[PDB]
Every structure is written in C-alpha cells, then in structure tokens.
C-alpha cells in the first residue's frame, strides 16, 4: 500500500471488528473496548461502491449478427470476419484484464489512504497529550477513562483540559 498504513506500520487487522472497516481499540484504566469508526468506513465504502457502479453499465450498443451457425457463409469472407472478431476478442480481453488489474491496485491503495487519514486525524487531535509509538497506538499521558477514550472517537477530545495534566 502506497501509504504504508494497511499491511504496514499497522501489522495486521482485527478479525473481531465486524462493525466497520476501521475503528478504535483502547485500553483505559478500567477495561478495554473495540468500536468501529463510521466516518472513515463510509468514506471508503462509498467510493468503492463508486467504481463497482462505474463498471456495471449498459452497452446500449446492439450488434446484429453477421455469421451463420446453420449454413456457413463463403470461406474468404468467413475467415476475414473471424480474423476480425478474434482481433476484437484479443483487444477486449486485454482491456478487461488491465481495467480490473489497474482498478484493484488503486482500490487497495485507496484504503491505506483512508486508514492513514484516520490515524493522522487522531494524532493532530491529541495534540501534545499523547505519543506516537509506531504500532498504530496512542499512549495517552493521562487517565483516559471510557468517557475519555470515546471522547476521542466522536472527535470532541479537548487536549487543553488535560494539556498540563500530560
């Protein structure tokens, strides 16, 4: 992934996070907790649903047939016709494989981005109240209770209130 986030400085993903695409997993004084982040998730989904839509379109182009399965057409014209059809088949097959191969590349990268987008959100948010370890976790330098951990999630965490106290 171009952003070094997914399949990067975040080792693996969470198989228990069946709530969304991304999410927060904290470990405050009391107990832990793992909640998905609606914001980022929908952003990716929507976009990906985008491509899929872009790809499922109507070729309102109608082709009448020119061959004949019963009673074959003359041989000279026949080979020319098929020589043509195959050339076309060679082309579309090539296109078909490049589109999908290309699209996918982008798709995957598209997530890194979103994942990375979130991370950078949390960082800048916490200002100078937490440190960036490297595994994707933010060790908060102050008792961040459940109401607090979540405070960060719904983007309401006001570093200042706990600035000095950090």
């Amino acid at each position: 992934g171009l952003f070094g986030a997914i399949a990067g400085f975040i080792e693996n993903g969470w198989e228990g996070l069946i709530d969304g695409w991304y999410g927060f997993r904290h470990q405050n004084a009391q107990g832990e907790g793992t909640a998905a982040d609606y914001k980022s998730t929908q952003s990716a989904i929507d976009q990906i649903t985008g491509k899929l839509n872009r790809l499922i379109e109507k070729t309102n182009q109608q082709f009448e047939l020119i061959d004949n399965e019963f009673t074959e057409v003359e041989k000279q014209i026949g080979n020319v016709i098929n020589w043509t059809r195959d050339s076309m088949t060679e082309v579309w097959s090539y296109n078909a494989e490049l589109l999908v191969a290309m699209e996918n590349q982008h798709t995957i990268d598209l997530t890194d981005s979103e994942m990375n987008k979130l991370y950078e959100r949390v960082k800048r948010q916490l200002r100078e109240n937490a440190e960036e370890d490297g595994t994707g976790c933010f060790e908060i330098f102050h008792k961040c209770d459940d109401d607090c951990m979540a405070s960060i999630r719904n983007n309401t965490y006001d570093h200042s209130r706990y600035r000095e106290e950090a």
Binding site: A7, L17, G23, K51, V73, A96, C137
Partner: protein
C-alpha cells in the same frame, strides 16, 4: 487507544498491477459465465420461424404459408428451417437474411402483374400443398401449349411508398434442353432485371443434374432493393419465375439462431444460440457470437474486482 482496520480469516485472491493473487477482504466477479438455456422473450413480439426458412417467408414455400406477412421484435431461425420447395438456392442469401432479420417483419402488396398468351399455373409435387402446387408469392409463368413459344414479355413495377421495396424473381434451370423448349419456347432465353441503380441479366443453364425432392431442374431466386419512386423492369422470354408480390420492412427487429425453447417469463437483450446471457457485468465468457445488447466477450473465465482493503489475518 489504538486504531486499526478489519480483516477476515479467508480472504479472496485478486490480481493487482504489481502482484498476483493477493488476498483482499472481498471481491466480486466481472466476467459473466451463467447462461439461461432459453430465449427470454418477455414483452417482445416473437416469431419462431420453425420449419420455415427466413428467406422462405419472401418466396412462399409450404413451410411458410403461416409467415408470408409477419410482425415482430424478435425473429428466430431454427436449424430445421428451409426456404425451399423445388430444389435450388438463393443467390447472395446471407445478405438477405441480414436484412430481413432486422426488418421488423414483412408486409406484402401485389406487383400488379397480369399476363397474356401464356399460362400462370406451373406447379410441382416438389412444392406439395393442397395436393401439388407452386410457391406462393410467386407465379411460374409458363408457355401455353407444349414446345410453344414464350412471348417477348415485359413487366414493370414502381415502388410508390416512402420506404424501399424488396423485389424477388427466380430463374428456372430445367433438367435438360428438351424440358426447356417444352415448358417455354425454344432457343436462347434471356431475363434482364433493371432499375435505377441496378442492372444484371440472367441466362438459364438447362442440363443434367441430380434429382432432389423429385425434380432435376432448379429454380434460383434473385433480389434487389427498390428505392422510393424508382421503377424495376423485367425483360424476359421464359424460364422466368415472376414475383407476384413485393415486400416492405415494418421497422426494427432482431434475428437470432437458437436451438433452445422460448420463454416469456424472463427478459433478455443478449441472445445467442443456446440461451440468453442475463447479466449486468461488463464481460462475458459464454459465447463470442452472442448478439443484441451484450457484455463484451473475453478469453478469461474470471477477472475479480476487489471491493475491499487488503486482507491481513492475525
């Protein structure tokens, strides 16, 4: 607090621009492979030619009495179809099939041809009907008495309608010069068809030939497309199988070849010999000769589109 992303135990393999067979959290096909073994005709005006040959709908052989004037959205040719009676062939046939296939159907109207000094019966057991007859939209102009003499005859028609007209005519090829100077007069026979942008001439080729469907002679049909206000002229002296009626296309329609049953319960726009390719995907690997509004035919059997991040199991 930490932040991550999801993942499943068994992801789905796909191909990237840089890798091959990478597991993503989830993908989806792109090349349709499912086929419906029926001709989904719901909502479409269908006409299964059956034992009638698409071209036979223009001449009039027994197999086609029920299709001399049909209206349709979808026409269908069957391998059992035949456009013939008396042994013979249709010169430049596939072209005619391509036209009628989208004609929307045909509409007959006489040529206004009346004759004198000759007979107009000319039937044959090869064209069995009501106990031996001839085509239908045709007339086998014959020399009155045996070994008689067909006149300098000339007939002409004028398409006076907005859209062009399909005009047919056949040339008879007796199984011998003896049968020829019998049915029609004697000597050289010349049939010349001419119009604004057309002008050929045909000559009979009477002589030994196999005996298909009881006859050794042959009647080959010819055709041109008469433009609006244009006039077609026939100049012959026998061996000419005259056209009793012209034809006009009703409008849009599609023709297919299938060996599968019609079904008015499903809907399709991509037909082919063995069914209908019902799918909204861009590519298909079913039949390279499918017609209508279809997905492009490719070689690959499957080209999977990732619809999820890369999958990273614990």
């Amino acid at each position: 607090i930490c932040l991550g992303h999801h993942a499943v135990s068994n992801g789905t393999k796909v191909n990237t621009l840089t890798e091959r067979g990478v597991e993503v959290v989830n993908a989806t096909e792109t090349v349709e492979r499912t086929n419906v073994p029926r001709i989904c005709s719901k909502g479409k005006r269908t006409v299964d030619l059956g034992q009638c040959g698409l071209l036979g709908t223009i001449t009039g052989p027994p197999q086609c009495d029920q299709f001399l004037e049909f209206s349709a959205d979808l026409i269908i040719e069957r391998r059992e179809g035949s456009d013939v009676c008396y042994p013979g062939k249709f010169v430049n046939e596939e072209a005619l099939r391509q036209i009628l296939r989208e004609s929307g159907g045909i509409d007959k109207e006489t040529m206004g041809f009346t004759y004198s000094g000759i007979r107009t019966n000319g039937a044959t057991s090869a064209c069995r009907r009501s106990g031996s007859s001839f085509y239908a939209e045709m007339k086998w102009l014959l020399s009155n008495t045996d070994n008689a003499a067909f006149p300098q005859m000339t007939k002409s028609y004028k398409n006076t309608r907005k859209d062009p007209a399909l005009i047919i005519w056949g040339i008879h090829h007796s199984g011998s010069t003896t049968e020829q100077t019998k049915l029609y007069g004697s000597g050289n026979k010349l049939i010349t068809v001419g119009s604004s942008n057309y002008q050929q001439s045909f000559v009979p080729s009477p002589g030994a030939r196999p005996q298909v469907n009881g006859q050794s002679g042959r009647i080959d049909f010819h055709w041109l497309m008469l433009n609006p206000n244009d006039t077609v002229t026939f100049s012959f002296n026998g061996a000419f199988i005259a056209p009793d009626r012209a034809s006009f296309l009703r409008g849009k329609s599609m023709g297919i070849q299938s060996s599968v049953q019609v079904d008015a319960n499903c809907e399709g726009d991509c037909y082919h010999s063995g069914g209908t390719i019902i799918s909204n995907l861009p590519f298909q690997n079913i039949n390279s000769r499918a017609v209508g509004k279809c997905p492009r035919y490719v070689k690959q059997e499957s080209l999977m589109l990732a619809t999820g991040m890369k999958n990273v199991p614990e």
